[PDB]
Amino acid sequence: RVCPRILMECKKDSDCLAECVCLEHGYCG
Numbered sequence: 001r002v003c004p005r006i007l008m009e010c011k012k013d014s015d016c017l018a019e020c021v022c023l024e025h026g027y028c029g
Contacts, residue, residue, distance in 0.1 A: 003029040
């Protein structure tokens with residue numbers, strides 16, 4: 001659940017770094 005507070009777009013969870021996942025806004029946590 002280590003996902004620093006950043007607002008970038010994504011398409012799938014594994015899109016961002018660390019353990020971030022793609023939330024409702026289609027953006028990473």
